[PDB]
Design a protein around this nucleic acid. Sequence first.
RNA 1: UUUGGCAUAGUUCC
DNA 2: AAGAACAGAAACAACGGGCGGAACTATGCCGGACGT
DNA 3: ACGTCCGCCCGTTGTTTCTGTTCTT
Lengths: 48, 49, 49
Amino acid sequence: LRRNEQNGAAAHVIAEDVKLLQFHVATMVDNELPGLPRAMQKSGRPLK
Amino acid sequence: DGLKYSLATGNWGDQKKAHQARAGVSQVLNRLTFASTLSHLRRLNSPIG
Amino acid sequence: FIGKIPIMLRSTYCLLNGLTDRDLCELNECPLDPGGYFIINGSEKVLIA
RNA sequence: UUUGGCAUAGUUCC
DNA sequence: AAGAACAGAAACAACGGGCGGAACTATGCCGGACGT
DNA sequence: ACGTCCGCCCGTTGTTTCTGTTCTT
């Protein structure tokens, strides 16, 4: 996101990346929100 | 690999979707006594929680 | 050739189907063994109804 | 004299 | 004798967290494809 | 010979609804 905001984006890549970073941080805090992608890493096991 | 995995682990389904796969099929045979072996080979199961 | 299918012991497509007790003893198999289980990676698996 | 974890199954005792 | 805007209280619907205590064995698994 | 991409209970909060007050005509 730093690189995109430095080199200039297409006004929607920035928004999608912001949403993705928000999802990653939220799932790091709690990985049980209702109606979420439910991030996994490997073998299909959800994180902790 | 699919047949071997489903029989080896007991999670009846694909490996990627072992979340809703019903576990508890394909147990490892009991060999403590002959009666244990027979009563294991003739066994039922109700999927109720 | 599309893959390998595990075979249940003593079933029609096993090597012990129809053999006499003397042949079973020759193969170091117990004549009293009931059969009806799979051999997956060495261990013996039993499907539960 | 050095330290694996996740899951599933079975069993013992109230 | 009539009409409007606002406000206080309530019926029903949707959502979320909660669900025993110990202990002992065993078995499978921890990502996949590609060639410059 | 390495390195890149892909099953039941019940506390909250919302939504919607139904009347009361006061001002004006």
